[PDB]
């Protein structure tokens, strides 16, 4: 029945979509800025591939989640 | 929705920051060729 169910809540409170965007977007930007710097000041021999892949992964993770929350704050509702 | 005053303030502040970064670039490059 529709009487034994509960009203559906969103997994994230809507009124915290903005505050959770910037925090998940600033950090991301920061990490990306750490990646870019690392690729300008490094010679071919000195570059380690594991640090490149790891910082790429973390920056992409936080940037992707931040882009989602930004996309959802403006009113697209993916 | 953004108003006109908010976006005008944003454009002004962004232009000022742009020209500050221009002068900072000139300072850095001249001081350390």
């Amino acid at each position: 029945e529709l009487e034994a169910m509960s009203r559906y809540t969103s997994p994230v409170n809507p009124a915290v979509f903005p505050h959770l965007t910037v925090v998940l977007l600033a950090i991301g930007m920061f990490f990306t800025a750490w990646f870019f710097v690392y690729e300008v000041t490094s010679t071919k021999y000195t570059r380690d591939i594991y640090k490149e892949l790891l910082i790429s992964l973390v920056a992409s993770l936080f940037m992707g989640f931040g882009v989602l929350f930004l996309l959802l704050w403006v009113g697209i509702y993916v | 929705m953004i108003t006109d005053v908010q976006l005008a303030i944003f454009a002004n502040m962004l232009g000022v920051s742009l020209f500050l970064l221009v002068v900072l670039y000139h300072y850095v490059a001249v001081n350390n060729p």
Binding site: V40 | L14, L21, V22
Partner: peptide, 30 residues
């Protein structure tokens, strides 16, 4: 911290902010 890396980072940042100022000053009719 080589000044060349920071110099290029500063150049990239100032070009991106020029892009954003050019895109943001053209929305007074939208």
């Amino acid at each position: 911290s080589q000044p060349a890396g920071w110099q290029s980072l500063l150049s990239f940042t100032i070009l991106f902010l020029a892009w954003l100022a050019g895109f943001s000053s053209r929305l007074f009719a939208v």
